Each structure stands twice: as C-alpha cells, then as structure tokens.
Design a protein around this ligand. Sequence first.
Ligand SMILES: OCc1cccc2c1OCCO2
Length: 126
Amino acid sequence: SVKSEYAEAAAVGQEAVAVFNTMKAAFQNGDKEAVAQYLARLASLYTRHEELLNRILEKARREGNKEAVTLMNEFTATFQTGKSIFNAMVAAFKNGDDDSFESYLQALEKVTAKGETLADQIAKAL
Ligand SMILES: OCc1cccc2c1OCCO2
C-alpha cells in the first residue's frame, strides 16, 4: 500500500540521518577520506528517498487523498530546501571551505529536524 511504501521511505530517511551523523563526526575529526565516501552515500540515499516520495505523492493524488496530497506537497518542497543545502555542503567540501561546510551542515540538521513533525503527519494521513 501507499502506507507501507511510506514506511519504506521513512526508513531510507533514517539511514541518511545515521550516515549524516557519522559523517559529521568524521568532518570534525578531519578524516576527509571518510567524509568524501559518506557524502557520496548521502547523495545516493537522498536521491532514493526523493524518488519514493514522488511516487507516494503521485499515488495519493491518483487516490484523491486531498489531505495527504497537501501534506506531501509541503513536505516535498521542504525536502528540496534540504537538498539544495546538501548540494552546497558538497560544493564546500570540494572547495576546501570548512567554514561554509560547517554552516550548511548546521542548516541541514535544522531543516531535517523541523520536517519531522510533518513527516510524522504524513504517516497518519496516508
Ligand atoms: O525527513 C526527510 C527530510 C525532511 C526535511 C528536509 C530534508 C529531508 O531529507 C532530505 C534533506 O532535506
């Protein structure tokens, strides 16, 4: 169902959170080789989460679940804010700008933490 497909997507989001927090530790420790690999892993995870989210939104629409569509439109928009911050973080790493990297890293943390009250709302609406 769309509800099990959303729990699958929720798990992929949790995986990115787990990898994000080991990446943050690696950045702080100056282990740049690990950061590089973790950032590639996060990209692949965020790409996947976004595809599951689009499929879920398209399905809620075909199902006429107005509330779930509203919530998923709001959630997909904020997901894109996070993705832009992520891409900027990645660019900061390539550039060697640790000041920008730290900034974007803190910003992504807060965009994702906010999005959780909506994430939890979607689960109950689908
Ligand atoms: O819960 C997932 C989530 C919520 C809010 C913002 C996000 C995000 O994941 C990718 C980056 O941006």
